A paper describes a structure:
To understand the whole architecture as well as the potential modes of action of [name] on the K2-type CPS of K. pneumoniae, the structure of [name] was solved by cryo-electron microscopy (cryo-EM). Atomic models were built into the 2.46 Å nonsymmetrized and 2.32 Å C3-symmetrized maps and refined iteratively in real and reciprocal spaces. Both the nonsymmetrized and C3-symmetrized maps presented well-defined electron densities in the core region, and they all revealed trimeric architectures, similar to the overall characteristics of the previously identified tailspike proteins with known structures. In the core region of [name], since the resolution of the C3-symmetrized map is slightly higher than that of the nonsymmetrized map, and because of the inclusion of the potential CPS binding, catalytic and/or regulatory domains in this region, we then focused on the C3-symmetrized map and model to perform the subsequent analyses. In addition to the invisible N-terminal anchor domain and the helical-bundle domain (to residue 185) that may form the head of the spike protein, the remaining core region of the [name] monomer can be further split into the following domains: (i) a very short neck helix and the connection domain (residues 186–271), (ii) the β-helix domain (residues 272–642), (iii) the connection helix domain (residues 643–666), (iv) the carbohydrate-binding module (CBM) (residues 667–846), and (v) a C-terminal domain (residues 847–907). The three β-helix domains from the [name] trimer form a left-handed coiled β-coil architecture that is mainly mediated by polar interactions, whereas the residues inside the β-helical solenoid are highly hydrophobic. Through comprehensive inspection of the single β-helix domain or the trimer of [name], it was observed that both the intra- and intermolecular surface pockets were flanked by pairs of Asp/Glu residues, and the substrate oligosaccharides might associate at this location and be cleaved.
In the present study, [name]-derived [name] [name] (encoded by gene gp32) was identified to exhibit high efficiency in specifically degrading the CPSs of K2 serotype K. pneumoniae. Phage depolymerases specifically recognize the glycosidic bonds on the host surface and randomly degrade them to release the repeating units (oligosaccharides) of the glycopolymers; thus, the phage particles can move closer to the cell surface and bind to host receptors. Here, GH-K3 gp32 was identified to encode a [name], [name], which efficiently degrades the CPSs of K. pneumoniae K7 (K2 capsular type). In summary, [name] effectively binds and cleaves the CPSs of K2 capsular type K. pneumoniae via the putative active center constituted by Glu545/Glu423 and Asp546/Glu423 and initiates the hydrolysis process, causing the pathogens to become sensitive to elimination by the host immune system and thus achieving protective effects.
Residue numbers in the entry:
A (entry chain C), B (entry chain A): 505 to 905
The structure:
Amino acid sequence: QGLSNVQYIGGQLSGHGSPRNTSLATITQCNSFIIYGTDLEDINGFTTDGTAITADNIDTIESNYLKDISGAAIVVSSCLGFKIDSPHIFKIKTLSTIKLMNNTYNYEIGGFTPDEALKYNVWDANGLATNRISGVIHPRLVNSRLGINSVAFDNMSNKLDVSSLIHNETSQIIGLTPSTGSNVPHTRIMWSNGAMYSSTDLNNGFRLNYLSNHNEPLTPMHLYNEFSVSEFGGSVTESNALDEIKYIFIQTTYANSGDGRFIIQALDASGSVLSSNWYSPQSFNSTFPISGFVRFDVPTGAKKIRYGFVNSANYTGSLRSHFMSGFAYNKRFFLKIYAVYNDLGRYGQFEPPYSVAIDRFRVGDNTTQMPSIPASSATDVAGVNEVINSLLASLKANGFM
Amino acid sequence: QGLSNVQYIGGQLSGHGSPRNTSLATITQCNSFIIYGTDLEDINGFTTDGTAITADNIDTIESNYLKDISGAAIVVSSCLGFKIDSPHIFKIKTLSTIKLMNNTYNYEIGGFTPDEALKYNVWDANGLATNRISGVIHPRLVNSRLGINSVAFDNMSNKLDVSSLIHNETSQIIGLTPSTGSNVPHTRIMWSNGAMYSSTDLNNGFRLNYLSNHNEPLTPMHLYNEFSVSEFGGSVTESNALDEIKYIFIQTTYANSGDGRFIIQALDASGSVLSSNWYSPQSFNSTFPISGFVRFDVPTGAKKIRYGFVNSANYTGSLRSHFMSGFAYNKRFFLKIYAVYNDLGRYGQFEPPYSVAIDRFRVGDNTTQMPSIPASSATDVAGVNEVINSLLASLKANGFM
């Protein structure tokens, strides 16, 4: 506690003999603590109170002891310039390997042995609105059997080394007629199913239909999308082909309450639901009070994924007033979904099409909206011809040709 | 061999006196081997058999001794957590500087002195279908006179720090009429020349036309694209302007056989071919059995690049049955081409156009396909006008206005 420019080179920290430890090393209020290849092993984990950390109660621990200085092989609190390279770590019977908290904001984490703790590899618990965290995490810790929590992925500046966006959407600048604002999407361009809530005020957003639970079948009335994953041929064995997507991180805007829900489902080849989850507006709070992330675990053997927005109470709701709370926290809606690939680009990452040699993709399409031509009633056999000539002239001038 | 948490700090490893060495250091079956600034120099390379590694036979070595524990200044085999920072290295007369093999899967490589070996800087020889490798390589080793092999670029998680995509294409979800499936592109939109194989089953893919060798001229019958590089003006000397692109990396899907070829050509100002190559379906096997990468070396003084698909045997082929082998390995075709820039963003990287302030690029075009209006034969001088009014109404409603 209270040190600066500390180097721990080589050496070892181990709990041989099963003593009761909150952590192997606890670091608080230091500036630049650096660990070079130290050997870490054999912890028998407890919380600061004295509660044992086992598998059976692991989830309980993560809810009730988030702010505790405990729960990891190395606990880091209020440390500037933390850094650990890639040592061998094993036999970790606590919740995580590294825990970060209390405005530890420029850390850097090398690739140590993955999947040794009980729940995560890196557990980030930084939680104050005025902090600006930005860390660097080795990519092989993220696509592993345990991975990192949603807040660590929020704060990981190099997140595009393991993932790509499979959905990116934001609201327009200029509202469409008719509307009273431009805080949400005004069309259903990004979605295969569902509808807009109301055609007289498009600024109410999407329509949210009732669904009793997150594992129920979705219908064409609901707002949702579907895509298929891990499509290998008949001459490939599944033991060799592997799984295409390991985790999915969803980011969207925060609100203090609401009955609307973001829902995600992983389904097998014959339509059956393998796993599923939904999330409420106040779950999206890793970067309170604006936005946040949540994590979905894709089970092995999934063939399709469905994602969307629904209503958890029995009536037809609106994105504006049942997910965004009347824009009390955010004035611009956005939705980004990141796919973490099981193996970097084995199946080819998803991203927008492009070609440096094709002008349609290199610069875009130069067509413009045509000026409004009034419907014509001229019946002397040439007013119709003049209108046709006007329409053809507009088509030629506006790019459609 | 068989160690864990090994640190080699400072020091030196050198072959002064020309002893016969397979490597300077050999590491096998270790966990966390870390090298901090060690001085490596002067190796006289041999293989494990006893074959001298010279320039004259270098290519032969890379084919026949890929699985040998030899051929580099540092050879790493089955090591977790390998790490080397940036020491000075010189006089490396063997194939590569670092060689990685046998499921070394979370490595990290700093920027040591580039271009000291005979063929590569980093040589990745990991080759098992069930491994998931993900490494971090300093960017300055990739755009150097030797660079890294295709497999290392495959496994390099930070590959978007040195390159950008100049072609990215994948197959649609819903097939177009008429087709028997949706495993390949159904349109020729991304391509300037060539045609689809058949108009009665679009799921046969592109048409592949005959080409006798990869250095022959391409015609408008062949499926190919062209773009120009390194466009400096009259007041710039070429010794100052330099070269825009250096190593071009292509991945696409694997298949066990086929006569189709992916072809690439670098051409000088007056249309002449400076260099060229083509690749078979089974060349794309760095991530067997799904996809893989190959590398093309752009010669200095190139002014244009052409890339595309052709047939190496004298008859007209199809992408489905002569490059993808009837979808025996992949159900989803894709093609990504990565340009490694000679000097970062000096000439401006290529990527799709965008503007946060323009709604056409911020959210997309809201136009929708019009409902089918049947051809009309009404000749009393007003049925034609009713049809025109219907067409104008559809145009106004569908966004064209």
